[PDB]
């Protein structure tokens, strides 16, 4: 790979309902989202069948949860704008249609919720700068103007609110190296100048919290091994080294926390298998990666049931949508094969960003 | 004190609304339940005033966030019966007034949100066991038929989840020790029989989770001071021993987990001003007890404000509400000193148990 | 109990020889040492036989491995002074017979190695301070003159190392709490005031030192179950507050170290059997406590083979001593059954401190 | 780098007398061995003087002490056989002068003490095998003949106690892979087959224990970065994925665990100064690395003081031994800067692999 290499994406985005239901977003072969979700918030309910959005997308969508409870999608438009749609109550499937919000869009957008209540969208300008607009009260279909951040972006952004609910932005930069900004105080605009984290990094930056509130990021590396960096202070300037870890991945990874605080990380493998690698203490060691059976052709997209069970999301080589999931709710679970979700074929509809 | 008696109870029941601000409800000299909020999510901001709701009520309400953001209070009423209250949108000071959720109730009622979204009430009963009802569909005014799961409670129930989304429920039984009974299958009617963990115990129990998803109990022990056990494995019959922190404490303890995932603890001490003592590192030992300036004449009500910072609230000698809270989002952050949220005065209502 | 009561202690003293085979020390019906040795480092290992010191005693015996490994014993004489006797070669059975270092004792002695490589002594002296004396050089029979640090004692003492490597001393206070005392430079004459760590004890004080270098001490309460506190920080004056464990015990406790790094502590139990817990995790919750089969007349005395094993001494009702091991490395293995290391009874001879 | 290259090693052997006074031994300009040693245990004190012994060796010097306290110290002479030297008595500098026990040795010699007190001694031997020879009796100047472990070393072997006393011995094969061999109990001669740990090394390995028992092995890796490995179980044969760090090393890595039980690993950077690196929390991530003033034309050598401060030696510019220490017995201490043990120059003895 090259050091300018973006590395594939996962192929749905993934919400949890008010009643913590998965919900799946994804784009067809008519460049339509498309969503399905579960019946019940169990890994083993019924899914309720592919529906159609009506509305030509040029993005993935991105969506997430308003604070009060209602699912919320951002997507680009055939104008290059930046469009939505949301639920019209919590937990119902009657959607509000899509809806404007202009700027000029040349990345997917990443939304993060402040912890204020108010949505607040990031996306790479037509300048390639980080620009972003916000919800001006929780919840509520009322926005700012669009407002600059500055900086030149090569990936999409990656926004995660740090424990004292300031919101931090990650995103790789002209020389390929991964750099920051961040929220000076909670939920306001107030924002740092942006710094480099260094090393090159060859996917989108994938961020989690640890359970004693530091953020952690995973990226891919210029070798195409995993590598992550983890604050180690109580502000957004004190970090870690950067590790790797054996073994060449193919695809942007995908982390979760488990039910028992540790951390889990998926990636499509170097034999482009599902691999999987864990903590086996408190910030412990890693584990040998473990790999699942069936070649997948996304990155992985991870969630967690309503009873912590992980279930994962890939594309399968049929261009549908699979997905397998822990038995029990338990670290050790044992783990189903891939069962499918049918109904359409799915396209990765991520903003080349070249 | 004596073995069967019960540590005085916080003044008043906080929650955070869909946007974090904070809101407490208290029962005045009326006998009304009055309630007042953060006008934003600092604990810096300013209050709203004191509001009533019109109806005579008989216990300490419990108030918890639905699934959709509305907040719902419940209490008993003159009748002995269940009632509740709930705002009628997120975020939103418009209120449905009392509504009847009938039954005979001799304890405070305890609020619990299932992780599939759904509200569930457990109270002490007519014949002295634990009974429930809940929401039929998440964040729904639809509730189930009143259901016993038995047992003999001589303290308020005390509820809360599980890491993988099992409801467990821990009350004082016959014999003044600790008794718990719980889900087997998360957010399902299933439940286990009551075992006792021994020890007996001199207020209400009090219950937190720790980071890695383990429940942790603390109650007064009958040599009045702080006592504590806590999940060892991943089920809910795995118990650590019982622990004891030096220090004669005169009220329920408050459990809150700080920013750093450690856990603190607040109750009124021997001198009866307001201590905390908190983990030193994870799960580390205890510091010794920290006092703060001020008599109090209630155990400790604690909250954490959309920062991360936390928030204390007390009945003072003159009968009215006063807090603390912490000026920095930090573990070692400095307190500010008790300042009034004047307007009415409050009312022990807690259901006398004897 | 009364606040005064010093709970029952071990029977033997034990050391591990330079090769690390086990050897005990106790004092039978003519008021002599005798002492007998495992013939290679294993628990399974035969036991070589009682051998007798010459010489009449009046206290427990100590001993302590030197720097160059030869084992060397202290006890009072029928003069009331401190004698020494040691090995004259490390692995060896050929012993000096009792030297004379002198003073007027009124405790039990007890010795620490240095981290320069010298054996120090303390004991409670004719006028109830703690007095101490030391090799002038390392493993060399060069004796400093004794030396008094004040205080009042009414324990024996209990000294371990800092991790620096300054001693610190326990010992109870006229007041029955736990005070202690320390070096404030390494392997110096340096030391500090006395400072008190509140709390009455019944017991000696016991000390070991945690992975990350604090010391944690244990002791028997007042209500007569299992007390600990530890260090902190990185100083001998920051300390945690006291915690106690439910579950009454009748004997001075004993602490190990076990092969994962976390503590166990052994104490006779209300029962009068042998009980155990030990540490769940990392600093983690404690274990309810585990009994084993057979009435024991002593506290425990607990040692660690050469493979990481641990051993338990007793005495039996039979006058006699007994002991159990684990049968693997391992911190879940299973324990041997008492068995018998017969030929000699014994006795208590422990100073009366009264 | 090639994948067969081997890091550039330390300059000295050090080792810890009786009395925990540091002494160094390295090879001048006259192919003899030469020994330097602290006056008294702190890295403040003076140094006695270079002091040589008579003969001409043909690899670096090992050194251990012995279970009586003696140093003894091991290397390759003129005929390719090994050969020993030891002091007489503890922390007396008389020693016995060189003694034969043969062997044809290909590699520096490896030295452990069994937990049975027996020194044993591994070495590379003609055929390319690991070979080793023991002490039959604690220390005692009576050896085992010759015994091979198979295997093929293209790096000199380190090896290194497990918790539970089973020596692990660890080597670059073949394949320039790191592999190991083990006890499969306790100071005993019954072996392990050989196993392979992946990864191509590009340095000697490094073992330490961290405080929990787990072994952790350090080495450079092909992209002449540090990585390192840790046992996950209680066994040989769990270890977690290989982690490497950012920062090109230009030496073999040195590692110890200071005072808090924190591990810490020092090595020549990319810049040919010294770097430091350390664990910022238990297990946790680790520093950016840390450089010192000063170019270094050697690995590390990294040693502990008798008050636990940490201490560095390295080969200068000169050709002459410096070293620089912590002034503080703490983990934040500050350093001072280089100074000389001068009086006789160093050359690099190491058997050349190839
Ligand atoms: C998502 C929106 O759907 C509509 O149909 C289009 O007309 C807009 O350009 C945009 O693509
Ligand atoms: C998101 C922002 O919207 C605006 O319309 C553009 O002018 C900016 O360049 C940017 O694309
Ligand atoms: C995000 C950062 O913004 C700056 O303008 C650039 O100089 C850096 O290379 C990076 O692109
Ligand atoms: C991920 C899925 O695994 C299965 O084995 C395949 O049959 C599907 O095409 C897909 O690749
Ligand atoms: C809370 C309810 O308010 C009403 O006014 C009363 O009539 C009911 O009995 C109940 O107390
Ligand atoms: C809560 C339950 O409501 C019912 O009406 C009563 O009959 C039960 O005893 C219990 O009080
Ligand atoms: C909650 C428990 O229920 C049982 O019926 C009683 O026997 C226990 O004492 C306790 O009250
Ligand atoms: C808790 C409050 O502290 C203040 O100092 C007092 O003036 C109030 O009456 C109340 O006791
Ligand atoms: C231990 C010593 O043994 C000797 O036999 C006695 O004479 C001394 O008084 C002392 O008791
Ligand atoms: C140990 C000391 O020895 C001396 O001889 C006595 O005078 C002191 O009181 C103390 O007993
Ligand atoms: C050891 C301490 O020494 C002091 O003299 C006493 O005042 C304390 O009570 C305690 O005995
Ligand atoms: C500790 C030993 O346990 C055995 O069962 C008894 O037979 C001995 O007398 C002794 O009490
Ligand atoms: C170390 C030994 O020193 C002696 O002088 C030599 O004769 C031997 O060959 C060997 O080198
Ligand atoms: C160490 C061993 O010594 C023996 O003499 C040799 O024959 C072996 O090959 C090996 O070198
Ligand atoms: C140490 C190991 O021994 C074996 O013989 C070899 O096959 C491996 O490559 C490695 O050298
Ligand atoms: C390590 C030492 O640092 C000093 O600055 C130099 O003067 C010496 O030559 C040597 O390189």
Do not use: M
């Amino acid at each position: 790979i090259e050091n300018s290499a973006i590395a594939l994406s996962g192929i749905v985005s993934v919400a949890n309902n008010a009643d913590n239901r998965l919900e799946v977003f994804g784009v067809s072969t008519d460049s339509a989202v498309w969503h399905n979700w579960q019946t019940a918030p169990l890994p083993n309910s019924s899914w309720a069948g592919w529906n159609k959005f009506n509305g030509v997308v040029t993005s993935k969508p991105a969506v997430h949860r308003n604070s009060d409870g209602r699912l919320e999608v951002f997507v680009r438009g055939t104008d290059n704008a930046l469009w939505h749609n949301w639920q019209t109550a919590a937990d119902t499937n009657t959607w509000s249609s899509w809806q404007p919000l202009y700027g000029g869009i040349t990345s997917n957008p990443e939304v993060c919720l402040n912890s204020d209540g108010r949505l607040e969208v990031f996306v790479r300008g037509s300048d390639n700068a980080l620009w972003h607009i916000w919800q001006t009260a929780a919840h509520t279909n009322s926005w700012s103007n669009w407002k600059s951040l500055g900086g030149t972006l090569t990936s999409n952004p990656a926004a995660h609110l740090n424990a004292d609910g300031r919101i931090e932005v990650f995103a790789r930069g002209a020389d390929n190296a991964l750099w920051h900004i961040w929220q000076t105080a909670a939920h306001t605009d107030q924002w740092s100048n942006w710094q480099s984290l260094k090393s090159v990094i060859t996917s989108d930056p994938v961020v989690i919290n640890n359970c004693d509130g530091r953020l952690e990021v995973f990226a891919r590396g210029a070798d195409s091994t995993l590598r992550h960096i983890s604050q180690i202070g109580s502000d957004s300037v004190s970090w870690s080294n950067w590790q790797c870890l054996d073994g060449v991945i193919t695809s942007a990874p995908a982390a979760v926390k488990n039910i028992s605080g540790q951390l889990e990380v998926f990636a499509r493998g170097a034999d482009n298998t599902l691999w999987r690698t864990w903590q086996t203490s408190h910030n412990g060691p890693w584990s040998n990666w473990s790999s699942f059976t069936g070649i997948i052709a996304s990155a992985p997209t991870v969630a967690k049931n309503s009873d912590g069970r992980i279930e994962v999301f890939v594309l399968g080589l049929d261009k549908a949508l699979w997905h397998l999931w822990q038995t029990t709710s338990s670290t050790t679970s044992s783990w189903t094969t891939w069962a499918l979700i049918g109904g359409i074929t799915l396209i990765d509809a991520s903003v080349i960003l070249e």
